[PDB]
Design a binder for this molecule. Sequence first.
Ligand SMILES: *[C@@H]1O[C@H](CO)[C@@H](O)[C@H](O)[C@H]1NC(C)=O
Ligand SMILES: *[C@@H]1O[C@H](CO)[C@@H](O)[C@H](O)[C@H]1NC(C)=O
Ligand SMILES: OC[C@@H]1[C@@H](O)[C@H](O)[C@H]2[C@H](O)[C@@H](O)CN21
Length: 862
Amino acid sequence: VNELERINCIPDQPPTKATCDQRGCCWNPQGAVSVPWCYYSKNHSYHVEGNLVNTNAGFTARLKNLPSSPVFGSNVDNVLLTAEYQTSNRFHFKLTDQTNNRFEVPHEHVQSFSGNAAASLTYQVEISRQPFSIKVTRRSNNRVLFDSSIGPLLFADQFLQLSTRLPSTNVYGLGEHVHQQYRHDMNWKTWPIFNRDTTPNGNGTNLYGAQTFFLCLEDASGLSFGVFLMNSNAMEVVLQPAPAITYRTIGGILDFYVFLGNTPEQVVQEYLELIGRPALPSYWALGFHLSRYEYGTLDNMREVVERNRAAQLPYDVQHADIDYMDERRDFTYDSVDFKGFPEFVNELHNNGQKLVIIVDPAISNNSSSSKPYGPYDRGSDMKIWVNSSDGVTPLIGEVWPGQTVFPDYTNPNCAVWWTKEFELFHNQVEFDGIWIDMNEVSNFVDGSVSGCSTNNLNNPPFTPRILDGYLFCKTLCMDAVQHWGKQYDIHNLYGYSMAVATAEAAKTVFPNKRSFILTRSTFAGSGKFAAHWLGDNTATWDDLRWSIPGVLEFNLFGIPMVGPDICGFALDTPEELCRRWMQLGAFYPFSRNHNGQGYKDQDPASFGADSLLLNSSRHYLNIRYTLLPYLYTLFFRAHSRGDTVARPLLHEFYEDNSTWDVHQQFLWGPGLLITPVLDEGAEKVMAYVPDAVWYDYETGSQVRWRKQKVEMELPGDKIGLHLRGGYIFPTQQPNTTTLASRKNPLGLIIALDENKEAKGELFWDDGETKDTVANKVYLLCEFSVTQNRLEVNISQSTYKDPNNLAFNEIKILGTEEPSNVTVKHNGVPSSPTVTYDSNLKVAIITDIDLLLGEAYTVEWAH
Ligand SMILES: *[C@@H]1O[C@H](CO)[C@@H](O)[C@H](O)[C@H]1NC(C)=O
Ligand SMILES: *[C@@H]1O[C@H](CO)[C@@H](O)[C@H](O)[C@H]1NC(C)=O
Ligand SMILES: OC[C@@H]1[C@@H](O)[C@H](O)[C@H]2[C@H](O)[C@@H](O)CN21
């Protein structure tokens, strides 16, 4: 056994020969650092008993345990393998207990399979009998993708483990963590996964969400595949240089999906096809959001709002944190500190702005005849709380308002209750969206106000290396009881269930509107319902750098609307950091400056009406807003097809191995390259320029760099922004709100490729109605340039914007001087103004009016 291929048989303690011998494993203390001294023997685990049986979907096999040591308790003697050839690109297999029903994730989107095996499979499945192994190969090149034969199958009631070899070290995914880099360190590394209230820092702990998806780029051809484990129990993922990955979980079942694609993007599309594509957001959510913990008073909030508005900051959304509430209790506001809250809501609305309020799951149990608290009374009446293990008594914990009960969002009735609470509150404060927080669920006491009983749920035979090392730390007892089951099994599903229930509530509170939901805790599929922010970061240069892979990873998980707290939540933010963070932050798909309690102000206009920071912030935010039709179309593609929004360079340039570990730059979709300065004191960035024609966004000039590392000069007022030749970018003159901005003239940026051609698209709908895509009430158009000719084609034309929108400017990059510019509408002509910069090779066509929704040909000569 090559030492990189050793599968650690002692994950639970310092390795000894005595434990090694008791477990029947192999002992060799002479490897390098982290090489397991004790590893599994070559035969051990399960064997296929009898023949595989063909089914309509695929096949089943009976696996029988080869007796061995009972290390982590009650082992499963007869295992059923059920394999389903679900589509040409998606293989599904599950290992279950043959004679006992086990917990299986009650996912809202994913349905059980009742089909016939798909035809024309891009993969082949090979089963070995003695001992059991499952292998999934790519048919085209027989590349082994999944191969369990590197280690055993382990299947005890509270310890399940399967490993797979990997075809490369190009592995991206898993969460929620601060991985610091984007390409996984396949050196010996364990990542624990269990939804936990913890700090995203340099420690690499489990965080707020649970994301088992990873994608592997096989080689420079782009061939890629992905793996998803459908399991909501505590677990860890062990990575090793074989290269190999081991999933180690403490309940449920091993329910695996293997996705094949021809590109990394297609793998993400295959994954999101299964778990659920992200919601199309409200167009205003794409705007800049402003927030802080503890304005303290409405007057303080109003003062921040008005200095930023006075600064002409693009600024769509104001968030109200727990200081709006009466003593930190849901569905109230402070009648003294926040007196006039409803009038302030009207002010926001009249300014073209939106209010997002924070809401917490945990509900104060402090209610009496003399001082009723409605949310609690109404919730008790309905019996929708999480119960202690007796199954009848609501579990009592402690969060912001003191002692609290916790809604059971897995109960359908709880969503009815939750909806009515929002209905009643909306009648008082007309908020536009909801920020759901602390929904892991988080508890200021461990378990409950009286702790948790010592038992196998609260104290299991094996605990993954989760922060603190106890499941119940800062959350509910594992034996707590809910509709979908015991907390042990469904803990990782609380934030997901809460997002589902909050979207249900939006059906009533915001009829036929998308609204906006921001969630802390997530599970696979939460993007269908909500955006995410990366939690309680810190105002440091490390945190600025770590933001990028975290953003890219959530785009793989199908939560493309993701970003950090710009400028850093904890700590006073240095001006230079916040300036660079705001430059970068204008390009996070979710863009919010948020600040923790008590720290110095970090809202852009607090640095000075004339400061370099405010000026730069406004500049790059005006650029973000200009490119909102482009961003919005990318979200339309993420919603309808499953594309990423913030995208790794390698997803576009996978043929180029120099892009495989790039995590300090990213793309918006296929065509905009963002290069932030990420280092203190720096006015330069060491950057990678991919294999394409690139144009400086502001000047339009073609860079001379192609396929190489560069020192990009980026003074304190700049971030690198380049447009990819070959792409057409729809724009819209910006305003301080998207309400206003959406009524402005549009533009096209045509960045020509080496062949003087370019292509693009634009999606347009009302920007807020739910179902516009499903119901085909939208405009979709395509732009193509092939020497001397721009064509605007209309493929879907069932929405006409009432604001007479039209492209009134076309900027062509990398062009020779255009002459005789003709504009035809269905072949019918019809002279635009043409301005030309011979040094830069930029033409701008103005005095033109291409109505959104109409087909045109713009023609020119040279
Ligand atoms: C919690 O207990 C109440 C009775 O107090 C009951 O009506 C409800 O069904 C219980 N919920 C669960 C998940 O057992
Ligand atoms: C920008 O928005 C304001 C409202 O705040 C509006 O009055 C103004 O006319 C808008 N700009 C354009 C170009 O219409
Ligand atoms: O509402 C109080 C704070 C917010 O300011 C913060 O963004 C959020 C984090 O999840 C925790 O720090 C708790 N929440």
